[PDB]
Design a protein around this ligand. Structure first.
Ligand code: MG
Ligand code: MG
Ligand code: MG
Ligand code: MG
Ligand code: MG
Ligand code: MG
Ligand code: MG
Ligand code: MG
Ligand code: MG
Ligand code: MG
Ligand code: MG
Ligand code: MG
Ligand code: MG
Ligand code: MG
Ligand code: MG
Ligand code: MG
Ligand code: MG
Ligand code: MG
Ligand code: MG
Ligand code: MG
Ligand code: MG
Ligand code: MG
Ligand code: ZN
Ligand code: ZN
Lengths: 261, 97, 38, 162, 177, 38
RNA sequence: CACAAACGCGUCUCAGAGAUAAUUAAUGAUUUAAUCUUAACCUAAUUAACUCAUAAUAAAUCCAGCCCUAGAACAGGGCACA
RNA sequence: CGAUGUUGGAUCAGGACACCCAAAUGGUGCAACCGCUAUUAAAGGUUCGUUUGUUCAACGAUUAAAGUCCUACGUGAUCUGAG
């Protein structure tokens, strides 16, 4: 279908590689996160009325895993599909003009350089944590005669209330949980290895699986019109893409070596 | 007569009032006459003449007012009330002028 | 315990209140209003 | 009922009064000696906000109350009928008596909340956040005290506050 | 009168589905009869330890009416439990958000306050408009009479009824409307 | 505007008006005569 | 910073729509002038809350062992390439 | 009174609004900039030091501001012990 104004694309499931510096023609330094798309397929399609009653849902698979360590149910689900099992599976909200056919590949070219994306992942698990690391309470002073208190939360409530309120910040589990980074510019796309270079830090540990989509932030809402939409299809155009696509502010790995004037 | 004074009658050329004293319906037009004839409205502009036409037979009271928009406003008071004539006069002759 | 005379109006024993409420003035009500008469 | 007509022809404007036909008081009243229009029809303490056939007789095509000296109502009853008319407008009866405005029918607002017996205007009432206990309690007015003299067939006085 | 034991007992304690139209009704007067029918207090066989209570289906809940200014003044309050979680909301707002809420709350307030309230709340079905699952339509035994008589507007009256009601006063011909 | 327990016209040009379930005194000549009943 | 990490002093990101109070206006009756109106009807201009778009989560049941950027325990992710 | 351990700090703050800042307005002996008053609004904020055990207070430097209070003069089965 052609592109309608309030439309929204499918996303990807990528793999956080590491981080790299990158420079812009104005001289500034940036740091970027490499996200490699490994094997990414749309798995099933839930219609609009069967899911949110608003937007359709596409279920996308992440990187391939071993057959032997999954469950009868799941293996049946892929058997009837004809893909190998995917590690991670996420659900994307999609306007019904954007829908693809389950069993379809998705590539890194799906995002064009200069754009903004949203990256969701499980954050680094820091385990059961104290009040200072988990919340950021100061402790009590170290030396001036404090006994066994140098870290503890202090008073946890009021005298009269006689209970402790439900929101009360207290020691506990920190970090294995899902967060989303917003407003991330994409700088560069490596088409050979399927690598997206995004701006700044993306939540999760390196080598973990990640969920990308276009930014739902307000200022970027209609950016989609210039993008390969239903998605990108390396088949159809019958022209190859360059090894790399860059933003126009990006100093390239080879270049004039900038001289101000 | 005050609301006419506040409104700066100077945009008017000539005001005549034609009415028939022995008819039962003419009190309204008369009230209009004494409202426009008052000293305030009369002295707002000296370029405007006020003429009272008095006939026994004409049988239809009328008010005719010309002003410098090239405009001619004619209201035939028959069943029309005084302050309806003066309100019509105000919004008609002020907003245009 | 309060003095007999006080500044603050002095809540009554309930039974006294009932007395007060029963003994209120009732104005006479004409059968037909004199205005709606001729 | 006297319509006032205005015409624009060639930089000349004509304004004229024109008389139409007024319906007349129904031939035979029950209490001809009776002074005030409500009373000679024996409607005193009988009509409510609900009785539209009665209320629509005193008002303007645009929904506003007629003046008292024209209608001839006994002062008290004039006030009662005014209360009732307000209450009936608010209740969503007399939908034909609004002023007609070709633009404003188009811009929908949240479908009109059905209400009845409303003493105040909706825009003017603060929500009561504090209620209050059994002994000091904030009560919400329903109907108007002007009608507290309507005949009660049950015998229990109408409940004006809850 | 002559039934076997089992079918007799079954017929007696049988559940029933009442349908109750809500359009232009005060949620209170609604909730009153709804409450009675939920507790099974309309059954001569009633007891508190018998499960007896019947299903009630209320419809046109969006079209509920409120006497007086109650739409403005009546506030539904609640607390999330978190500090600063206290939420007061005017009945207009609550109704705007969730069509069923007002009537549901009223009924939930009028049931007795024991544990059975939670059960007999499950036998209450509320639909904002008239769209009902045909499943739920097929059980309806009978329809309760609406607790308020709805006054007609001026345009509802037949011209017969309009000319039948007397002109009370006679307006001057000179006067303009 | 001042919030007052008693409203009174401070000159001939003051007029008295009921808005938002309150009484008000508006004055066109001296705006300092503005008053809101509490 | 003498573990491959953790960490700040370092780096990244951070938002649309509706709603209102006070107070300003337009039309206009009771009170045929006026008048923002606990008069109607449509109305406009307008704080913060607060709701809500939207985002997040979202495959019921292989799990001995062994690994883990996952973990007090229990759980959780891997173990076909190579 | 067969014990309801007490001042000020530390930590963490819950709440009121009689608002110190931020927002929206009315009046001015409001030209503008400042101000002085009053209305509405409590989501978020409300500094660092010298001396005092001090709360107050004085002083240095700042801040958009360095609010008034309630919570057993919040909080010692979390700390302090100068008084
Ligand atoms: Mg960990
Ligand atoms: Mg420290
Ligand atoms: Mg010690
Ligand atoms: Mg010790
Ligand atoms: Mg120590
Ligand atoms: Mg308690
Ligand atoms: Mg005594
Ligand atoms: Mg008028
Ligand atoms: Mg004006
Ligand atoms: Mg939501
Ligand atoms: Mg496992
Ligand atoms: Mg003691
Ligand atoms: Mg003891
Ligand atoms: Mg606090
Ligand atoms: Mg205040
Ligand atoms: Mg301010
Ligand atoms: Mg605060
Ligand atoms: Mg004390
Ligand atoms: Mg204390
Ligand atoms: Mg202490
Ligand atoms: Mg101790
Ligand atoms: Mg303690
Ligand atoms: Zn009378
Ligand atoms: Zn004055």
């Amino acid at each position: 279908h052609p592109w309608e104004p309030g439309s929204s694309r499918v996303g990807l499931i990528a793999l956080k590689l590491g981080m790299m510096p990158l420079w812009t023609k104005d001289g500034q330094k940036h740091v970027v996160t490499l996200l490699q798309v490994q094997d990414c397929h749309v798995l099933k399609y839930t219609p609009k009325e069967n899911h949110n009653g608003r937007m359709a849902a596409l279920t996308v698979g992440g990187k391939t895993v071993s057959h032997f360590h999954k469950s009868a149910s799941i293996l049946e689900f892929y058997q009837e599909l004809g893909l190998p099992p995917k590690q991670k599976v996420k659900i994307f909200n999609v306007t019904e003009n954007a829908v693809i056919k389950p069993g379809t590949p998705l590539y890194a070219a799906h995002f064009r350089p200069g754009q903004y994306v949203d990256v969701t992942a499980k954050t680094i698990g820091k385990g059961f944590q104290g009040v200072m690391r988990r919340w950021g309470f100061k402790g009590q002073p170290a030396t001036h005669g404090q006994t066994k208190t140098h870290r503890r939360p202090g008073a946890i409530s009021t005298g009269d209330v006689a209970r402790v309120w439900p929101g009360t910040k207290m020691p506990g589990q920190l970090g294995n949980i899902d967060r989303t980074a917003f407003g991330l510019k994409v700088w560069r796309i490596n088409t050979k290895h399927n690598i997206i270079y995004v701006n700044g830090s993306v939540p999760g540990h390196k080598n973990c699986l990640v969920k990308i989509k276009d930014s739902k932030l307000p200022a970027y809402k209609d950016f989609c019109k210039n993008l390969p939409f239903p998605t990108y299809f390396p088949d159809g155009d019958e022209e190859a893409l360059p090894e790399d696509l860059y933003d126009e502010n990006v100093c390239q790995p080879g270049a004039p070596s900038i001289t101000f004037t | 007569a005050a609301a006419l004074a506040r409104l700066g009658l100077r945009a008017v050329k000539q005001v005549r009032v034609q009415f028939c004293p022995f008819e039962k319906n003419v009190e309204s037009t008369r009230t209009f006459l004494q409202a426009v004839s008052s000293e305030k409205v009369r002295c707002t502009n000296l370029n405007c003449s006020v003429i009272a036409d008095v006939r026994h037979d004409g049988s239809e009271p009328c008010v005719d007012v010309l002003f410098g928009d090239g405009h001619r406003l004619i209201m035939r008071g028959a069943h029309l009330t005084a302050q309806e004539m003066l309100t019509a006069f105000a919004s008609h002759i002020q907003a245009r002028g | 315990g309060s003095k007999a005379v006080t500044r603050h109006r002095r809540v009554m024993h309930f039974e006294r209140q009932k007395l007060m409420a029963v003994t209120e003035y009732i104005p006479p009500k004409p059968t037909i209003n004199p205005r709606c008469l001729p | 009922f006297r319509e006032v007509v205005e015409i624009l022809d060639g930089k000349t404007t004509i304004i004229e009064g024109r008389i139409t036909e007024t319906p007349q008081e129904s031939p035979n009243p029950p209490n001809p000696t009776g002074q005030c229009p409500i009373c000679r029809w024996n409607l005193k303490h009988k009509y409510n906000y609900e009785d539209v056939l009665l209320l629509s007789q005193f008002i303007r095509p645009h929904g506003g109350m007629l003046p008292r000296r024209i209608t001839g109502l006994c002062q008290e009853e004039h006030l009662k009928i005014e209360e009732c008319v307000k209450m009936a407008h608010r209740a969503g009866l007399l939908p034909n008596h609004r002023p007609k405005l070709p633009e404003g029918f188009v811009p929908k607002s949240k479908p009109r909340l059905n209400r009845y017996l409303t003493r105040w205007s909706p825009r003017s009432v603060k929500p009561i956040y504090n209620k209050g206990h059994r002994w000091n309690k904030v009560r919400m007015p329903v109907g108007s005290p002007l009608l507290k003299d309507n005949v009660s067939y049950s015998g229990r006085p109408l409940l004006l506050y809850h | 009168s002559s039934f076997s034991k089992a079918p007799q007992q079954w017929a007696t304690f049988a559940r029933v589905w009442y349908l109750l139209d809500g359009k232009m009704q005060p949620p209170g007067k609604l909730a009153a009869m709804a409450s009675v029918k939920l507790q099974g207090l309309h059954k001569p066989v009633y007891h508190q330890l018998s499960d007896c209570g019947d299903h009630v289906v209320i419809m046109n809940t969006r079209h509920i009416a409120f006497s007086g200014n109650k739409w403005e003044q009546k506030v539904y309050s609640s607390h999330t439990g978190y500090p600063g979680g206290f939420r007061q909301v005017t009945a207009a707002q609550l109704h705007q958000k969730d069509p069923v809420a007002i009537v549901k709350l009223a009924i939930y307030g009028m049931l007795p306050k024991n544990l059975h309230r939670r059960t007999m709340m499950q036998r209450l079905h509320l639909f904002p408009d008239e769209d009902i699952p045909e499943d739920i339509l097929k059980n309806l035994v009978e329809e309760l009479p609406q607790p308020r008589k709805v006054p007609r507007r001026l345009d509802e009256y037949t011209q017969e009824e309009i000319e039948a009601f007397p002109r009370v006063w006679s307006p001057p011909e000179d006067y303009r409307l | 505007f001042k919030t007052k327990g008693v409203l009174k016209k401070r000159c001939r040009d003051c007029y008295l008006v009921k808005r938002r379930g309150r009484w008000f005194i508006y004055c066109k000549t001296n705006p300092k005569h503005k008053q809101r009943q509490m």
